[PDB]
Amino acid sequence: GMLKILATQFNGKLQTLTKQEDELFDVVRLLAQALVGQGKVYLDAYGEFEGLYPMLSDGPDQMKRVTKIKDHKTLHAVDRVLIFTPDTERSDLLASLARYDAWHTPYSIITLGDVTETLERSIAPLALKFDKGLLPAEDGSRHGLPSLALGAFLLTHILTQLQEMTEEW
Amino acid sequence: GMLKILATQFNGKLQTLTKQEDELFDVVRLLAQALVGQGKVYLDAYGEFEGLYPMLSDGPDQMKRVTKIKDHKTLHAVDRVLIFTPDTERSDLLASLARYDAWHTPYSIITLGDVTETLERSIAPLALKFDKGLLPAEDGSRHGLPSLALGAFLLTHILTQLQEMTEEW
Ligand SMILES: [Cl-]
Ligand SMILES: [Cl-]
Ligand SMILES: [Cl-]
């Protein structure tokens, strides 16, 4: 029934992410640059993706020097920002990107939507194209969208890959 | 190919869940009982699962009468509580179950751990047995635990099923 359809459709998306291992490794590499020095990685999450924050403070793959973005803290060129956002039209995201640009702080943007001009400002972008539901209906509408689940899965991957790199040092 | 390995490990768990469709239906039916009357469904999430809260307020499958548990608010027998917790040993969890018991409010407990006496206090429990990493290390230790991802996937399923049922009415 619904559980099996949702699970199999969700896994379909996980499999197709394998085709973008390189773009995801570009994200990891960008972030790892902070950790080779005395920079920090900051997660700056928007909307529903604010649910990612407890993964860094309370989660099983948490790590020192990967932390929640702090309002009003000036970042520096050695720091790196990981952004998860539902879309790139948000005014709060735009204000943050203007700040990072002024600080010369690089950022990876992971968007639930498609590729946009704003997304292209990121040195390590990823367009998930996963902003519509997985269960189609009668009228052309769709529902059942495990969007936070996808982001959380990706953050687990990123954290695990970063920690694996760090241990190798 | 870390990404593909984590994806396939995670999917292995998704596949075993789909064989527990009946226990998950027990969760959904218990919660749906609130929606027949004037009661509400409350999410009471612990530890890393506090990351689920933004799904109810900002997520794609949000619905009016499924909301975050409120501090100090006395619930009634027509309300329903959905709990996600890393384990059933937490003193805050036990203190909450004592309150719900005093108020005669039914609760569903989804635990990342195994079946316990405390879990069996729930009329609709689910033990995820998903509290150790998916990627073994030389240590014997395990890393890469997409625990929030699983929780978020399950909340999407529950939200989407409650909405489909509510529409049928
Ligand atoms: Cl600087
Ligand atoms: Cl009552
Ligand atoms: Cl026990």
Please provide the DSSP assignment of A49-74 as one string.
Answer: GGGGTHHHHSSTT--TTEEE--TTPP
DSSP codes of every residue in B67-116 = EE--TTPPP-TT-EEEEEES-S--HHHHHHHHHHHHHT--EEEEESS---
A87, A112, A153, best to mutate vs chain B, most B CBs in 10 Å: A153
B118 CA distance to ligand 3 centroid (A)?
7
Strand partners, B136: B142
C-alpha–C-alpha distance, residues B117 and B125, integer Å: 11
In whole angstroms, what is the distance from residue A89 CA to residue A93 CA? 8
Q: Yes or no: is domain B1-169 CATH 3.40.50.10490?
A: yes
Closest Cα to residue B14, out of A19, A68, A139, A9?
A9
**Cα(B88)–Cα(A3) distance, integer angstroms:** 25
Cα separation, B85 vs B90, whole angstroms: 9
Q: Alpha carbon of B65 to those of B28, B49, B110: distances in Å?
A: 14, 20, 20
Instruction: Calculate the dihedral angle through the C-alpha atoms of B65, B70, B74, B77, rounding to the nearest 10 degrees.
Output: 40
CA of B48 to the centre of ligand 3 (A): 22
Q: How close A95 gets to chain B, by Cα (Å)?
A: 20
**What residue spans define the domains of chain B?**
1-169
Tell me which residue has tokens 């890959």.
A161
Do the beta carbons of residue A80 and residue A33 sit within 8 Å?
yes
Question: Which method resolved this structure?
Answer: X-ray
- Tell me whether residues A54 and B58 touch, CB distance under 8 A: no
Token pair of B133 as six digits:
């990493």
Contact A31, A158 (CB under 8 A): yes
Residues in CB range of A73: below 8 A, 6 or more apart? none
Compute the distance between CA of residue B9 and CA of residue B135 in angstroms, rounded to an integer: 8
DSSP classification of residue A75: P
CA-CA distance, B166 to B169, in Å (whole number)? Answer: 5
The residue among B80, B78, B77 whose CA lies nearest residue B66 is B80
Query: Rounded to whole angstroms, what are the CA distances from A129 to A39, A49, A86, B6, B131?
Result: 31, 15, 10, 20, 30
Cβ neighbors of A62 (< 8 A, separation 6 or more) are: A55, A56, A159
Residue with tokens 């973008």: A20
Resolution reached, in Å? 2.0
Ligand 2 mean position, distance from CA B105 (Å): 8
Place of tokens 């529950």: B158
Q: Which residues of B touch A160 (CB under 8 A)?
A: 2, 6, 135, 143-144
Distance CA B162, CA B29 (A): 8
- Chain position carrying tokens 């879309």: A87
Q: Are B24 and B63 in contact (CB under 8 A)?
A: no
